[PDB]
Amino acid sequence: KQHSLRNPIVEQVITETLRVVKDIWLKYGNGTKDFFNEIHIELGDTRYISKYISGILSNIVRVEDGSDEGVNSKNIVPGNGKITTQLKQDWGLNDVWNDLILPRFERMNQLTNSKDFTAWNENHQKFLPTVPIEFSKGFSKKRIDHRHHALDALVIACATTDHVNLLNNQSAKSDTKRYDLKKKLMKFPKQFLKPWEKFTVDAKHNLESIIVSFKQNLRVINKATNYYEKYVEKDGTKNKERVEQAGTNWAIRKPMHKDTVSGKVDLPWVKVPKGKILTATRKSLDSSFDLKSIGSITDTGIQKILKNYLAFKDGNPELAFSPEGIDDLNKNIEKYNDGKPHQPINKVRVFELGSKFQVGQTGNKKGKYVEAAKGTNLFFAVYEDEKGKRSYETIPLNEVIERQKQGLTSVPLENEKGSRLLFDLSPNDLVYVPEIDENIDSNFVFSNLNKEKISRIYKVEKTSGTECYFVRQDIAYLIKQYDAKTKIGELESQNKLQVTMTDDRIRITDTCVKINCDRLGNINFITKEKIKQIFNEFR
């Protein structure tokens, strides 16, 4: 049931954890009994999950013999950050993590033409990732990725109950009593024994071969039930009862547009490019009104009086347009209007040139012009013409709503030029960007995804017009964001690129191929058996 926990965040986390556990059960053990011998749990406010998920998951790994009784199964072994960090340092997970993340740091070094982002060492005789102190506000080398989560999960899983007991109750009161665990788990007390000989190499191989699955919310329309009180004639008597609404009525599950509403204006003294219009909105006349912004005020006489005043104050809007300055202007409007009388001014209609759409078509709604809301450009169409060139478009939420209401596909399957649609992209999608030499037209065969193949996987982040921005799927946070002062950043000003990060710097949208993964990050592609089942399920 919804709203059964502290807050939506932990509820979503727990629900997705359950879903992922079910998926792994089906994929790796076919849902049979006691397929999970043991489960280890860790969190790393959030403590609300440490006990609820353990209690819920006790139902799978519990033993009915009567030995395992209590609030939680004895097989569930929560840990602590001490064990995970000590194992990571001892077993070399930290070293492989730095080797995995370092190329981002060399890219930052090259982009800033310095050497301060990599530090050489001689105890390891290699370069370690690093950041300058003035870019070290809250930088963390683990946090800037997504697969660290999986790395933590791995280092937790191999940690047995003996390890957590040893590292939580190290106080022995006698060396001999705990010396058995010392000899069994640690090499001689210096370093712990690996779970197996090839642990580090296998962990490297997996970590460099993980694709991250991103949950998507493409809800545009859904069905809504309307119950309303009404007097109904039954058995010759009128009774008040609830009635369900007749006909069809959809509920939009996204904010259709932005709150601010503007009105259309036509100004002879400005040139309007085709496909764009001028919209004017009222705004307070305040200290941020300089010559360029004063020239963006729709009234010409207000512009005349206002520039006269600004000249009178030595061209300083801060002194001119303080509340005291505005009052002085209002009291003495004659000595800036060439001596002509005029009403006071506190708010003015500033105009902007761009693409704003009508909110509706009834009454006076046809005069309200709004802008698309945040996070509502959800579909990005990629088409091809018979010759071979790719065309791009972004369909607004209005056409998505109308198309989905008429039972059609969200994106038109052909553009106005007749170009056939490759496919549509949404935020959190995954695409493969092939090399410049590869010719991916009927590739498929997505079973042999190696490190080079997986490193060329990009996730959509946002779209606008014909532009689509991508981030490598393994990137969570940038090493350094963008600031208008230094004008530097990991992925330039937008913190996301329309091209690859690698040296070729190729348009991602011109060669990318959309892919589909499941909750477990396993690629999904057409196969014979699948083709058979398409219409076996109809057979």
Partner DNA sequence: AGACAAAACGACGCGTCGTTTTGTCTCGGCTCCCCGACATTCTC
Partner RNA sequence: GAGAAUGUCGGGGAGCCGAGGUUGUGAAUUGCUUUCAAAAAUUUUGAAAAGCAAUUCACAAUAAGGAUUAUUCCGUUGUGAAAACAUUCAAGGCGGGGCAACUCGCCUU
Residues of this chain that bind its own copies (CB under 8 A): 385, 416-418
Q: For other proteins, which stretch binds (CB under 8 A), given 12-20, 52-60, 107-115, 361-369?
A: 361-369
Measured CA distances, 102 to 10, 105, 106 (Å): 33, 5, 6
398 counts as binding DNA under rule CB under 7 A: no
Tell which positions 444-473 bind DNA, by CB under 7 A.
467
- As a 3-state breakdown, the chain gives helix, strand, coil percent values, each rounded to 5, of 30, 20, 50
Enumerate residues 6+ apart whose C-beta is below 8 A from 441. none
374 counts as binding DNA under rule CB under 7 A: yes
Q: Select from its own copies, RNA, DNA, none the partner in contact with residue 418, using the beta carbon and a kind-dependent cut-off of 5 to 8 Å.
A: its own copies
Nearest to 300 by CA among 258, 341, 351: 351
- Cβ proximity to other proteins, 245 vs 494, nearer residue: 245
d(CA 342, CA 336): 10
d(CA 533, CA 377): 34
3-state SS of 375-419? CCCCEEEEEECCCCCEEEEEECHHHHHHHHHCCCCCCCCECCCCC
Residue carrying structure tokens 């996730």 = 459
- Cβ proximity to other proteins, 236 vs 407, nearer residue: 407
Q: For DNA, which stretch binds (CB under 7 A), given 240-248, 313-321, 429-437, 488-496?
A: 488-496
Q: How far is the CB of 506 from its own copies (least distance, A)?
A: 27
CA 234 to chain centre: 54
The answer to whether 368 and 359 have CB atoms below 8 angstroms apart is yes
Q: Fill in the amino acid letter for 475.
A: I
The answer to whether 127 and 119 have CB atoms below 8 angstroms apart is yes
Q: How far is the CB of 417 from its own copies (least distance, A)?
A: 5
Q: Fill in the amino acid letter for 370.
A: V
Binding string, residues 338-377; x marks residues near RNA by CB under 7 A: x-xxxxxxxxxx-x-------xxxxxxx-xx---------
Nearest to 276 by CA among 178, 356, 366: 356
4 counts as binding other proteins under rule CB under 8 A: no
Q: How far is the CB of 340 from RNA (least distance, A)?
A: 4
Q: How far is the CB of 414 from other proteins (least distance, A)?
A: 5
Binding string, residues 377-396; x marks residues near other proteins by CB under 8 A: ---------x----------
45 counts as binding DNA under rule CB under 7 A: no
**Is residue 238 helix, strand or coil?**
strand
252 counts as binding RNA under rule CB under 7 A: yes
221 counts as binding RNA under rule CB under 7 A: yes
Q: How far is the CB of 414 from its own copies (least distance, A)?
A: 8
In this structure, the number of other CB atoms found within 10 A of the CB of residue 359 comes to 16
- Cβ proximity to RNA, 49 vs 220, nearer residue: 220
270 counts as binding other proteins under rule CB under 8 A: no
Q: Select from DNA, RNA, other proteins, none the partner in contact with residue 59, using the beta carbon and a kind-dependent cut-off of 5 to 8 Å.
A: none
Tell which positions 11-40 bind RNA, by CB under 7 A.
12, 15, 19
Footprint of DNA (CB under 7 A):
6, 51, 258-260, 271, 273-275, 281, 374, 396, 467, 482, 484, 487, 492-494, 498-499, 507
